[PDB]
Enzyme design. Sequence first.
Site, PDB file in Angstrom:
ATOM      1  N   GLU A  39      -1.246  -3.733  -7.437  1.00  0.00           N
ATOM      2  CA  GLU A  39      -2.364  -3.752  -8.382  1.00  0.00           C
ATOM      3  C   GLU A  39      -2.084  -2.816  -9.588  1.00  0.00           C
ATOM      4  O   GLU A  39      -2.973  -2.119 -10.095  1.00  0.00           O
ATOM      5  CB  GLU A  39      -3.682  -3.410  -7.665  1.00  0.00           C
ATOM      6  CG  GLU A  39      -4.912  -3.600  -8.538  1.00  0.00           C
ATOM      7  CD  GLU A  39      -6.126  -4.066  -7.770  1.00  0.00           C
ATOM      8  OE1 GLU A  39      -7.250  -3.879  -8.295  1.00  0.00           O
ATOM      9  OE2 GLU A  39      -5.971  -4.625  -6.657  1.00  0.00           O
ATOM     10  N   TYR A  76      -5.087 -12.734 -15.863  1.00  0.00           N
ATOM     11  CA  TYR A  76      -5.167 -11.477 -15.154  1.00  0.00           C
ATOM     12  C   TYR A  76      -3.811 -11.201 -14.485  1.00  0.00           C
ATOM     13  O   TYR A  76      -3.339 -12.017 -13.695  1.00  0.00           O
ATOM     14  CB  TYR A  76      -6.294 -11.518 -14.135  1.00  0.00           C
ATOM     15  CG  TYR A  76      -6.326 -10.296 -13.248  1.00  0.00           C
ATOM     16  CD1 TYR A  76      -6.892  -9.100 -13.693  1.00  0.00           C
ATOM     17  CD2 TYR A  76      -5.769 -10.327 -11.967  1.00  0.00           C
ATOM     18  CE1 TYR A  76      -6.917  -7.959 -12.871  1.00  0.00           C
ATOM     19  CE2 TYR A  76      -5.776  -9.200 -11.149  1.00  0.00           C
ATOM     20  CZ  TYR A  76      -6.356  -8.017 -11.605  1.00  0.00           C
ATOM     21  OH  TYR A  76      -6.374  -6.903 -10.785  1.00  0.00           O
ATOM     22  N   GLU A  78      -0.632  -8.357 -12.718  1.00  0.00           N
ATOM     23  CA  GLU A  78      -0.277  -7.118 -12.031  1.00  0.00           C
ATOM     24  C   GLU A  78       1.227  -7.011 -11.892  1.00  0.00           C
ATOM     25  O   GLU A  78       1.935  -8.031 -11.926  1.00  0.00           O
ATOM     26  CB  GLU A  78      -0.844  -7.121 -10.620  1.00  0.00           C
ATOM     27  CG  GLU A  78      -2.311  -7.218 -10.584  1.00  0.00           C
ATOM     28  CD  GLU A  78      -2.887  -7.323  -9.177  1.00  0.00           C
ATOM     29  OE1 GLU A  78      -4.133  -7.505  -9.109  1.00  0.00           O
ATOM     30  OE2 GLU A  78      -2.132  -7.215  -8.169  1.00  0.00           O
ATOM     31  N   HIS A 134       0.877  -9.089  -2.772  1.00  0.00           N
ATOM     32  CA  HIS A 134      -0.557  -8.922  -2.875  1.00  0.00           C
ATOM     33  C   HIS A 134      -1.145 -10.322  -3.126  1.00  0.00           C
ATOM     34  O   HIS A 134      -0.998 -10.913  -4.230  1.00  0.00           O
ATOM     35  CB  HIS A 134      -0.925  -7.954  -4.006  1.00  0.00           C
ATOM     36  CG  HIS A 134      -2.399  -7.857  -4.254  1.00  0.00           C
ATOM     37  ND1 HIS A 134      -2.936  -7.665  -5.510  1.00  0.00           N
ATOM     38  CD2 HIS A 134      -3.452  -7.953  -3.406  1.00  0.00           C
ATOM     39  CE1 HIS A 134      -4.254  -7.646  -5.424  1.00  0.00           C
ATOM     40  NE2 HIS A 134      -4.593  -7.823  -4.157  1.00  0.00           N
ATOM     41  N   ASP A 168      -1.011  -5.895   0.427  1.00  0.00           N
ATOM     42  CA  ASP A 168      -2.404  -6.286   0.618  1.00  0.00           C
ATOM     43  C   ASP A 168      -2.440  -7.783   0.779  1.00  0.00           C
ATOM     44  O   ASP A 168      -2.520  -8.535  -0.201  1.00  0.00           O
ATOM     45  CB  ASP A 168      -3.241  -5.891  -0.593  1.00  0.00           C
ATOM     46  CG  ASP A 168      -4.708  -6.344  -0.486  1.00  0.00           C
ATOM     47  OD1 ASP A 168      -5.105  -6.974   0.533  1.00  0.00           O
ATOM     48  OD2 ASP A 168      -5.470  -6.061  -1.437  1.00  0.00           O
ATOM     49  N   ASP A 212      -4.478  -5.037   4.630  1.00  0.00           N
ATOM     50  CA  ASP A 212      -3.093  -4.680   4.334  1.00  0.00           C
ATOM     51  C   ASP A 212      -2.231  -4.740   5.599  1.00  0.00           C
ATOM     52  O   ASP A 212      -2.649  -4.303   6.659  1.00  0.00           O
ATOM     53  CB  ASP A 212      -3.025  -3.287   3.695  1.00  0.00           C
ATOM     54  CG  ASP A 212      -3.861  -3.190   2.440  1.00  0.00           C
ATOM     55  OD1 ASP A 212      -3.282  -3.330   1.322  1.00  0.00           O
ATOM     56  OD2 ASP A 212      -5.099  -2.994   2.581  1.00  0.00           O
ATOM     57  N   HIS A 252      -8.272   0.755  -1.076  1.00  0.00           N
ATOM     58  CA  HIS A 252      -7.436   0.593   0.135  1.00  0.00           C
ATOM     59  C   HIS A 252      -6.728   1.860   0.558  1.00  0.00           C
ATOM     60  O   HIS A 252      -6.361   2.703  -0.268  1.00  0.00           O
ATOM     61  CB  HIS A 252      -6.368  -0.475  -0.014  1.00  0.00           C
ATOM     62  CG  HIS A 252      -6.900  -1.813  -0.415  1.00  0.00           C
ATOM     63  ND1 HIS A 252      -6.947  -2.884   0.449  1.00  0.00           N
ATOM     64  CD2 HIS A 252      -7.403  -2.254  -1.591  1.00  0.00           C
ATOM     65  CE1 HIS A 252      -7.461  -3.926  -0.179  1.00  0.00           C
ATOM     66  NE2 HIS A 252      -7.743  -3.571  -1.417  1.00  0.00           N
TER      67      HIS A 252
END
Lengths: 260, 32, 372
Positions: A39, A76, A78, A134, A168, A212, A252
């Site tokens: 993230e 979006y 990461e 993720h 995750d 996770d 997390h």
Amino acid sequence: LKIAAFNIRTFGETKMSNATLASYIVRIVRRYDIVLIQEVRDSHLVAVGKLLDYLNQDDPNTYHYVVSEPLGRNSYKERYLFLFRPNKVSVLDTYQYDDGCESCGNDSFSREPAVVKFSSHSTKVKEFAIVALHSAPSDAVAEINSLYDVYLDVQQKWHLNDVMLMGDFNADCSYVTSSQWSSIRLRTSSTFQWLIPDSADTTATSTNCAYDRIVVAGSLLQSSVVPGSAAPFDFQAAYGLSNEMALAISDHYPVEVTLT
Amino acid sequence: EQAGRNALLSDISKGKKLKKTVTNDRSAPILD
Amino acid sequence: ETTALVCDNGSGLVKAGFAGDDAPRAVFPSIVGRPRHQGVMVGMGQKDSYVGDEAQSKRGILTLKYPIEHGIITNWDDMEKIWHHTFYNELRVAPEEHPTLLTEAPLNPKANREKMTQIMFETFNVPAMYVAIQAVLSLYASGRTTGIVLDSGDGVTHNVPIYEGYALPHAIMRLDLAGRDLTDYLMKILTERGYSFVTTAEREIVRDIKEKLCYVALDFENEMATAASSSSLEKSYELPDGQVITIGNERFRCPETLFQPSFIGMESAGIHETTYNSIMKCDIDIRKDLYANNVMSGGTTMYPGIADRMQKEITALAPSTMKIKIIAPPERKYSVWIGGSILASLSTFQQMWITKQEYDEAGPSIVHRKCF
Ligand SMILES: *[C@@H]1O[C@H](CO)[C@@H](O[C@@H]2O[C@H](CO)[C@@H](O[C@@H]3O[C@H](CO)[C@@H](O)[C@H](O)[C@@H]3O)[C@H](O)[C@H]2NC(C)=O)[C@H](O)[C@H]1NC(C)=O
Ligand SMILES: Nc1ncnc2c1ncn2[C@@H]1O[C@H](COP(=O)(O)OP(=O)(O)OP(=O)(O)O)[C@@H](O)[C@H]1O
Ligand SMILES: [Ca+2]
Ligand SMILES: [Ca+2]
Ligand SMILES: [Mg+2]
């Protein structure tokens, strides 16, 4: 060898500019010989740079890095970030899962897995890979199931059975219900051993979710895992935080394991 | 002061058709 | 067919390509970065250094250097890295087989022009090279050889009177205010109304708003009055995260700085006044031609309305009956490059290159006679 995977909510410039929170992130990273940070919302890599500035302010080779481009099905995006102590391991090769064709990694994954091949001298496994993921909460079942294919890809490219898949996974609660486990090849195939169990709480929030995970394949690697060492690392308990402070760090906990 | 300067300046006045070229412009701001 | 290269080095952007072309093949940041730490991008091997667009986008793990300040080259090792990236990565060509036209800022020191030449011949081994003054090339691009250029880029703004192809050193004005100061000032005044821009992306966003929503008022005080009494000039602007912000008088206060440098604490005359002061430092005979041939070039002249405003400002300054004409071509962000592409692909120019042979005999100081 201590290894970890840690979704740091919107890890970015704002967060790492905050001395206190940086402080805790550093202390946490410092626990590990290899750590996967997820993230990462860091458009020009400034936050990655600050953290490394802290990690290396004494010895410039305390930590080295592997970082991906910004990744995400839509706008979006990461990054995946691997931090590792060059004195404890070495990076032999790395690539991004692509499914044999440019945009084709986006066919299974919102964030195409980064794959790192490590060399490790102080453990029974001498070479292993780590696949980062993720997953997209709403497509978690397919993405975790697709991880089985990533493993095949690794096996084929590196002729290597010792593979750690982690991050995750969103693997619980409303995103993976118990009846859906029978449809994830990563869980049903005996090749894989699941170190963080379904009962684990890996969220810093009110929810009780084993989101996770750490999965390992290959006898050698498996046989290198320190029994009972795999657990989420609750940093609120560890550092005696209020919940407000815990949540400002991430929603997390890292999940960690130890190899011997 | 060179030889053939005037002819050069004359040609700059006449102008010249140039060729279609797609720019690989990487000056745009990166917005996040 | 042996094609010449055109390379326009700027404080913020390098513009590069082939003579004969209507536009540069490549525009990227004039930047060089060396990694502050040891590591790799996924799928990649380790790199000693990055240039251009890559350096900009990875700046946070790098140490950046801008080899070009106010248009002048101050760092040679790094300029060298940039020209290399230009040939081999950007234009994908071998320097040892292309004549190359290079540009320089006005008032560039001689030693500078020489070091430029020396590197081209002795490092990159070009067959032939030339150096031209930027303002002059963008005059050329507009099909003329006499007139006055206002060139305003990222770090620096010049007024350059040109007569029969030659810049007039004595009358050149330099104003130390340009795109960057303008970006900073927008950021300052956006903040003054409560917005926040502190991340790198967030600073990048200010530039975007500048380039897309700003303009010059034909009359600043009337514009202020209108914005004070109606939403007619408000403008929504949408962020990455999709929420919207409004931009009122900041749209035209930002660029007004060019005319009123006191907006950022400077004591300068504004670009209208320096344009006029430059013409007035010139020969009585040539002034009519300077006034009728006011060409504008550079990223910082891209403001909607700027030509009209200049037009009005100059008329108010000049003799009652002087013919005045501002030429503000739509491609003017890249006029310097474009005039370079014209000049270097013209038949009648093919004799004016400095050759490897000439440089070997005469040396780097041959660049003064041969680049008249
Ligand atoms: C760095 O990150 C931390 C964690 O979010 C920030 O601390 C938190 O933010 C402010 C600190 O001024 C606190 O809110 C305040 O609550 C107190 C209650 O006594 C109130 O007096 C203030 O008016 C304000 O609302 C918050 O409690 C605090 N700690 C948490 C949330 O655990 C910090 O401010 C960030 N920025 C820095 C330190 O530069
Ligand atoms: N549409 C636009 N409106 C206003 N400013 C713009 C626009 N497009 C680009 N700019 C500004 O122009 C600047 C870059 O201009 P340019 O490329 O002409 O200068 P340069 O050659 O890099 O530097 P210099 O000429 O100062 O040495 C940047 O600050 C940029 O924000
Ligand atoms: Ca929880
Ligand atoms: Ca320029
Ligand atoms: Mg559970």
